[model samples]
Structures are given as C-alpha cells and as structure tokens.
Target: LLAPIKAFLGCETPQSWLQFATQDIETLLIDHANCEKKAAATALNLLFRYVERKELLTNLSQLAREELLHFEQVCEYMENMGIPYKHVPSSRYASSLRKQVRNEEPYRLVDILIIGAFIEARSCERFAALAPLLETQPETQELARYYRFLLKSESRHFEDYLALATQYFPDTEADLHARIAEIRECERELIESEDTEFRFHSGSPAPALRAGI
Candidate 1:
C-alpha cells in the first residue's frame, strides 16, 4: 500500500502525523468517516460535471458506489462503539490542491483526475502506516485490520482516476505526466507543512510535536 503511494508522490507522510494519529483514535475515525463520505461526493461531482465525456458517468458511477460502501462500513465501526461520529474541522490537504486545479477545459478535468489519484494514494499510504501501530493497542486492533482489508480495493480507486484522465484529458501523454508531476508537488507541500488541524490526510501538528514549537 505504501509502496505505490510513496513512489507516486515524491515524499512520505511525516512521521509526526503518524505519531499524532494514534493519540486520539476516536477523532481519527470521525475525520476518516468524513473522508469516506467526501470521497463519494467528489466522484459524483465529476460524474455530473463531465456530462460530455463519453463513458465518464458510467465509470465514475461505480467508483462512487465503492466510496459509499466504505462510508457505510465505517459507520458500522463507529456505531458499534456508540461513537457519535459527528463533524470535525476538515483538513486543509484537499482544498489547498483544489485551489490550483485549472479552470480551462481538459486541463481542469485532467488535473482533477491527477489530484484525485494522490488522494487515494495518500489514504492507502496511511492505512498501511497505521495498520501495524494500531495492532499494539487492544482497542484498535481490529480497526487496524479493517483498514488493511480496505487497502486492497481502495488501491484501485486512484488508478481509475488516472485511467479516466488518459481517456478524456486532451493533452499528449507527456503533457499529462507533466501536469501530474506539478499537482504532486503541491500535494507534497500540503502533507509536509505544519497544520493547525489534523485529519487523516493532515501533516505535522501545529502544537509542539517537533522538538520546539
């Protein structure tokens, strides 16, 4: 899981984020639950937007369902614990990149897909990162395994986004790769910087996680 993502992105998620993720597993779930729901919403947003792209809705429709299933599955985890599963401040990781998605045709769609790949790649990277750590704690042991199990199918979701971009994006293969590389650096910046808010995709904490605040 970490292999593809780490290679795909130029860097790894900061160790500080990993350290902090375990500090409040409950909050992590709330943050994660929100991610799952938003994942579907993001896919559907594409389905609706690219109405002119042939086979666009058909492919994304399946991806959206997979996201919803994960959302419902995550709900089961929280429900069993009687965790409220309420809203929390979202991470800045996504919007920071979304702000850079170009407004021009094909460029807009291609960037969306490229950035979308990173989203899945990041989620995959963290699930694997957290799996072994969660094992040491009795409370979250099974949750660890669930994340591990989720890792496999989730692996394919990002690939699909890139897949669609190749099919629909208007640039030559080299240009597409060029655009992908650009968004990748932007995502890396968001992941490596300090963040006041923490989510599944957030970077190092704003509080003194590092040596000195």
Candidate 2:
C-alpha cells in the first residue's frame, strides 16, 4: 500500500492544504467516507449509463465493489469514533470538473473517464499526505493505515480509467493527451485556489474564512 508520487500526474497537493486538513480530522474523515460511497456510485453510473462497452462494464463492476467496501470500512471507523454519519454539502471540485466535459458522445465518455482518473489520482495523493500525520496519534493509527489501504486501490483506479479512455480513443491519442493536460491545469487551479468550504477535496480556504470570520 505504499503510494508513490507517480500515481499523481498533476501538481502535488500543497503542504498548506494538508496542514489545514489535519487540524480537523473529524471533518476530513466524514468527507472521505462520503467520497468513497460516491466513488462507488460513479462507477455504477458508468456501468449503467454506458452499457455499450463490455470492457467498461467489467472494469467498473470490480471498481465499484472495492469502493463500496472502502466506504463501509470508513463508516465503521467513524462509528467507533462516535462521529455521526451526517450529510455534508458537496464541494465544487467534482461538479466543476464535470462542467469541463464536452457535450458530444465519445468525447463525453473520454472526458468522463479522464475526470475519473484525476479524481482517483487526487484522492491517492491526499491519502499519502494525510496518513503519516495521522499515524502520529494513537487513536488515529488504524485510520491512518486504512488510508494507505485505500491508496492502493485508488492508484489502480486512476490507471484503469486512463486505460479505458485510451482504449476507446486509440486513434486520437494526441487528443486524449491534450485533454488530460488541459484538465490537469484545471485540477491544479481548483486545488490551489481559495475555497470557502473545508471538505476533503476543497482548496485552501480564504484567510478570513479559515479564521471563522
């Protein structure tokens, strides 16, 4: 479960973001649990909405199962910690990325797969950044180890999504790379910019907001 840096293609998550996240582990855990469930559902969405591709269905079925298991583990941990499983408002990160997808057919599928890659890669990066810090606390040791476990699957999920995109658009490899580069830039901007919220995937909060002003 050792997550190497190669899993993350775009810019690394800022240390400041990790520092801020560590300040409130409970909030981060809540959002992370939610994210795992959403990830499973995202795969299911691909499985159903794009049923034409047998490969997509096969790959996403396994991915969805793994994501759901992760969700259950996170929820169990939260239960032990006495953290209620309450609904948290979504961060704009995923929706902002989805908005970048083209409105066409194959192009839309390619973009969605690429977006999935970015999301999984970013999740892996955050897990790597956060787990070690959490390990410093006795109470969070198991949780930290669990993050490392999640990182393994996330790293593979990133690669699998990218592979699917390439398989679907082999003739347009150039176009696929270009789109990934463009989305990488978008991903970096979203990560480094100021975010009003403090969810798991949020950007750096504004100074005033950070101070709870």
Candidate 3:
C-alpha cells in the first residue's frame, strides 16, 4: 500500500509537532487499527440492520476482511514492542459524524457511504502528516512502515466510499458532499481540540504523552 503525499499541506504539521508524533507512532498505529476494526464491524452491523443488498453486503465484507487483517498487523507490532494491549478510551469522533446521517433508506446508504469516505480521508490525511516525521525514531520504524503500507489502501477506500455514494445516489452527491465538508470541519476540531483522554483520533495531546519542558 502506497500512502499519499508526505504531508497534507491543508495545514502543515511542524517539525516539532512531528518529532512528538514519532514518539506516538506506535500508539497511533494500534489505536487507528482498532478504530478501523470497529468501523468495519459497525459497517457490517449497519448492512445487516439496514441495507441488505447483496452487492453492498459483498463490498462491506471485503472491508471487514481488510480491517481485520490490519488489526492483526497492529497486534503483532504491539506484541513486538511489548506494549500490552489496552483499550484507549475513544473520544466522540465517530458519534459526532454519525449525527449527520439521514434516517431514510437510500439516504441512510448515502450517509453511511459519505461517513466512510470522511473517515478514510481523515485517516489518510493524518498518515500523510505523521509518516515522514517517523524517521527520527529508530525503535518505532515499524510504525511508519505499517502506516505507509496501509496508506494506499486507505486512500483507495476513501475513493471507493465516494464511488459507492456516487453510484447509488447520483443525484445526492452535492448534498452529501456539503454535509461531508461540514462534518470534516467538525472532525478536524475534534482532532486538534483538548481532551482528557488519549486515543488514536483523540483530541489534544494527553499530559502523560506531552513533551517535557
């Protein structure tokens, strides 16, 4: 899997920021991989709970398989580093985004697809931001390696998500796109804002992991 650009200039994450990021690379990997697994499971649940279309079911099944594989990779990395697995409390990342989903069938499908696109896009953006910064950490080299590997797939996942929305709800792209833009702004805030806990998509740097003066 090939990652996108080294960094997303949408906002340039500073070298100092990246130095701290290298230290957190492993945390980012495990948390992000877990997030992907949860996301896939959630998608599966939604497919069964709402749209049971054979094609959609098939597509989501592929997503679940890929996510689970990535999860295994993350577990392996953590095991290698002797970082015992613990559930990092998640912030309101997914929930806040879900609020924008329309409740109707086709609308529900479009909403879910749009949500999928947004999730992948954000992850891709972060990976682009973090991977290059990983060069300084010798012990955590695997962290960057894995992220770079997953980048291409995740970027494609973003495209596929948008494509699915486009295919099923051709006329609704503009509306869904608008909604995505709003949610993305909300999402970025959630990422950069303050929070009491630390997780993959957690807001602000937790004190425990912060740089010491």
Candidate 4:
C-alpha cells in the first residue's frame, strides 16, 4: 500500500525533520490541523475553479468533506494533548509548488492536480514516518493511532489527484510526465535541503532550528 507513495515522492521525509517533529509534537499537531483545513480548502477552490467538469465536482466535493472531517479529527486530538490550536507560520512547501504551476488553462488544471498528488503523497509518507516515533510514549499513543489511521485515506487521496490529472489532461500525458519529472526534482530539493522553520511539510532542520540545541 505504501510502496507506491514512497516510489512517487522524490525522497523520504528526512530523519532530521522526524526527530525535530517528535521533539516538539504540539507544533506538529497544530500544523497538522492547519494542513487538513488547507487540503479541504484546496478541494473547494478546485471545485469552484473548474465548475464545468461534472465528474470533478463530485470528486472534489467528496474530497472537501473528507478533508474537513480529517481537520476536525486532528483538532480533537490536539485538544486531548492539551495543545491549543493557534497561529503558526505555514510551510513554504505548498506555496513553492504552486509557484511552479503555469498560469494558463488545461495546463494549469493539470499542474494543480499533479501538485495535489504530491501534497497527499508527502503527507502519507510523513504519517508512516511519524507513527513509530509517536508510538513510543503512552501520552502520544493516541496521536500515533490517529496518524496511522490517516495513512490509507491519504494514499487514496494521492491516487485521486493523480488520476484526475491524467483523466483531465488525456492528450498530453507525455508532457504531463515530463512535468512530473520536473516537479519531482523541485520536491526533492525541498525535502533534502536545509530549512529554518519546522512545519508538517518542511524540509530537514537547519543548524539553528531551536537555538541552544
């Protein structure tokens, strides 16, 4: 099940990001809740953007609801951990990918869908990475369970987005794969390189991550 997700992504979530995330999990959950909402928001935005596609409306509308439900689930777990849902800077991951997108038609839709697949794929990979570390403690056990439960759906979400990309842009699949390869390089850099901030989708931790570490 996880094999394809691992294969799809350019690289694994770095051990540094995992270790940093486990060190301060409250921020992880808060950012997770934020990510869930953003996922739903993206679904809605697509629904609104390409209203003409009947099939898209059905798929995205369902996706939006499920994402919102996931958002609620994360928020509930946050409360159980006594972690307040508060403002934290969003990761540059998604924005950086969006910036790569072409500002045009069919091509624009395809790029967004492909980006969505990467987003879902990365989130799926992170859940797998975080589960073991999170499962070590009794306090974090439930949260680990929550992350584990998310694995199946996130993988499905990855496929859903990818399928839409191909389904919508049927003619130029060669071009699509070329774009995927290009974007794959982009995602790899973000994952393997240094990052100053830590969020759910952030890269490896920088030397000065928390100061006095």
Best by lDDT: 4
Tens-digit lDDT track for model 3 on 104-205? 778778778877876777677667677666644777667778778878877877777777777777466577667656656776676666555455556666
Predicted structure 3, TM vs. truth: 0.80
Local accuracy of candidate 1 as per-residue lDDT tens digits, 1-213: 556767888688788888888887788898888888888898899888888876668878888898889889888999986689676878888888789889888788888888888899888888888999999988888899898998887788877877887887775888878888888888888888888777898887877544332
Off-target runs (Cα >4 Å) in candidate 4 are 210-213
For 1-213, candidate 2 gives per-residue lDDT tens digits of 334434345677777677778677788888888888888988998887898899999999999999888888888999998889877878889989999999888888989998999999888888888889989989889888988877778889998998898888745677777888999899989898988788888987778656862
Off by over 4 Å in 3: 1-20, 50-52, 170-172, 206-213
Model 4 C-alpha lDDT per residue in residues 1-213, reported as the tens digit of each score: 899998999999988898898888887888888998999999999998899877778988998999999988888887777898789979999999989998878889988999999999999999999998989999989988888999999998999999988888856768878889998999989888999998999998998995635
Model 4: per-residue Cα lDDT at residue 90: 91
Q: List the residue pairs that clash in candidate 3.
A: none
How big is the positional error of residue 101 in model 2, measured in Å on the Cα after superposition?
1.2
- Lowest lDDT sum, 10 consecutive residues, model 1, at 204-213
Q: Rank the candidates by TM-score, best first.
A: 4, 2, 1, 3
Would you list the C-alpha lDDT of every candidate in the order shown? 0.83, 0.84, 0.67, 0.89
- How many pairs of residues in model 3 come into backbone collision? 0
